[PDB]
């Protein structure tokens, strides 16, 4: 009858939602593993155990932390369809697929690219100083927030589907989606610019400066005065060396910094839109990088 200390076990086993991760079917075995006590308590005499394993081993990929809503809605539906014979085998899958994309899109940026980076930076602030309280706080706060979120969302999903129709488009449960999307777009653009190194290394031109730019490092006063003259002339803006070495990176940076990064991100997005598997794309990035370094573009 789905006692409380059964959803305790279900939520604790949800910690192992991953582990059986596979390219063919993603997070299916882990999802089955997190539902095992629910099968154990409510079913009997083995005719429908196999059907349970079949209907809890299909494709299911979402953010690991925000997955307890599904794990609660499935219990809410199953505890009632057995006691009342309203078995569907298709609405329990329809709810799984309908809450697949949006929940992943509201959980991935918030947890991976919003809370993870800020908590890691805060922890490394004290950690880079040698203080253990940094990592201790990171660990404790992260665990508290994940466990609280999973428990609250699971017990909210335990509520029947009569409430999920209003608890899918708010109100408040839809505004959070838009806010998370905006915050994720901001942080993701920042990450794309800052942490995608496509630093080119060609050389465009080697032009010697006119006799009005270089410091003339052959006629300075000798000893404690030429030093000051050179420093003041550098602060004026005189070109350091005789040849103004120019790189394609410098020319590209004059439009927008990190143009190659955003161009590559858009190319990868377009490739993913063509149903290409990300593994092939990652191998393509590796091969293009190595052949570019061989040629000399990078």
């Amino acid at each position: 009858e789905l006692s409380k200390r059964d959803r305790l076990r279900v939520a604790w086993r949800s910690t192992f939602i991953q582990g059986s991760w596979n390219y063919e079917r993603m997070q299916n075995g882990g999802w089955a593993f997190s539902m095992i006590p629910a099968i154990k308590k409510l079913y009997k005499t083995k005719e429908d155990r196999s059907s349970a394993l079949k209907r809890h081993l299909e494709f299911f990929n979402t953010h690991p932390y925000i997955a307890s809503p599904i794990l609660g809605v499935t219990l809410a539906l199953e505890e009632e369809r057995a006691n009342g014979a309203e078995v569907d085998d298709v609405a329990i899958q329809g709810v799984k697929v309908g809450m697949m994309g949006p929940l992943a899109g509201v959980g991935d940026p918030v947890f991976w690219f919003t809370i993870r980076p800020m908590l890691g930076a805060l922890g490394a602030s004290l950690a880079l100083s040698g203080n253990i309280l940094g990592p201790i706080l990171f660990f404790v706060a992260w665990n508290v927030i994940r466990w609280g979120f999973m428990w609250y969302t699971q017990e909210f999903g335990y509520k029947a589907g009569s409430k999920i129709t209003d608890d899918l488009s708010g109100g408040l449960l839809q505004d959070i989606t838009k806010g998370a999307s905006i915050l994720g777009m901001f942080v993701l653009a920042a990450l794309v610019q800052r942490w995608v190194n496509i630093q080119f290394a060609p050389i465009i031109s080697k032009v010697k400066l006119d006799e009005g730019a270089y410091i003339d490092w052959s006629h300075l006063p000798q000893g404690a005065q030429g030093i000051k003259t050179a420093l003041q002339q550098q602060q004026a803006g005189l070109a350091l060396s005789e040849i103004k070495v120019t790189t394609l990176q410098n020319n590209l940076d004059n439009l927008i910094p990190g143009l190659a990064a955003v161009a590559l991100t858009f190319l990868c997005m377009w490739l993913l839109k063509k149903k290409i598997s990300p593994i092939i794309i990652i191998l393509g990035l590796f091969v293009v990088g190595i052949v570019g370094h061989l040629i000399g573009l990078l």
Binding site: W21, Y23, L57, D108, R146, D175
Partner: protein, 247 residues
């Protein structure tokens, strides 16, 4: 050095390895994978600095939708072991951070092969599922988790019983065209991880926010925390305007 130290470090390496794809308690994070491995090896304050330094880089290394991130767990343990075995607990931090990053050649392939090797595991799971033996799936799952932990457990044990330099690797690597090509490709894979999530959520209403974030992320003035706070503030302002503006 001691028999207790090796078993403790391999056990915590196994735990970090399983957390590598479990990604729940975050032992695989260098903020934790480098302090637990430093607390038990003696010098503790000499490893928290390295953990923080690697955590700063490790931001934005999420595994997004079947797209892996470079050296989520292997680097955190591998750099720390080299730091603690070779001395210079504080002076060797740059040496360890200069070897943690280029392990993507042995970090991404080594994890993706493990991820694709578990397809027969779920096939056997279904095979035992037709007969309805639900006691075997709950064993196969931890079997897969342990197999995942092996990929970090084995190299951790190997590092102790080899010279503490580990920048040789039997062959001195292809003549300076592979070791740097793989490195420069390792700084590019994360884009794919971004490319999916940006594709996951993309409407004409939020693209200008992407443009603003990509612009205001310019030279060396605003930190990552500052940009995150700016994004939160802009999102809150937009939601406040939208809530009253609807009607």
């Amino acid at each position: 050095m001691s028999v207790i130290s090796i078993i403790l470090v391999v056990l915590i390496a196994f735990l970090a390895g399983i957390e590598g794809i479990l990604d729940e308690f975050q032992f695989h994070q260098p903020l934790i994978a480098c302090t637990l491995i430093g607390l038990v090896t003696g010098n503790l304050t000499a490893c928290i600095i390295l953990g923080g330094t690697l955590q700063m880089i490790a931001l934005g290394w999420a595994n997004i939708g079947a797209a892996v991130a470079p050296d989520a767990a292997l680097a955190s343990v591998a750099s720390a072991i080299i730091l603690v075995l070779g001395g210079q607990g504080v002076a060797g931090i740059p040496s360890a951070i200069a070897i943690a990053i280029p392990l993507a050649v042995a970090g991404l392939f080594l994890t993706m092969i493990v991820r694709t090797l578990a397809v027969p595991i779920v096939h056997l799971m279904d095979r035992a599922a037709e007969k309805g033996n639900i006691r075997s799936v709950e064993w196969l799952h931890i079997s897969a988790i342990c197999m995942q932990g092996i990929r970090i457990a084995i190299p951790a044990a190997a590092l102790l019983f080899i010279p503490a330099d580990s920048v040789q690797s039997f062959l001195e690597a292809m003549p300076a065209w592979l070791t740097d090509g793989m490195a420069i490709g390792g700084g590019m894979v994360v884009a794919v991880g971004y490319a999916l999530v940006i594709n996951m959520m993309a409407t004409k209403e939020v693209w200008p926010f992407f443009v603003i974030g990509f612009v205001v992320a310019a030279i060396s003035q605003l930190t990552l925390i500052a940009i995150g706070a700016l994004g939160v503030a802009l999102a809150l302002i937009y939601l406040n305007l939208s809530k009253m503006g609807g009607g």
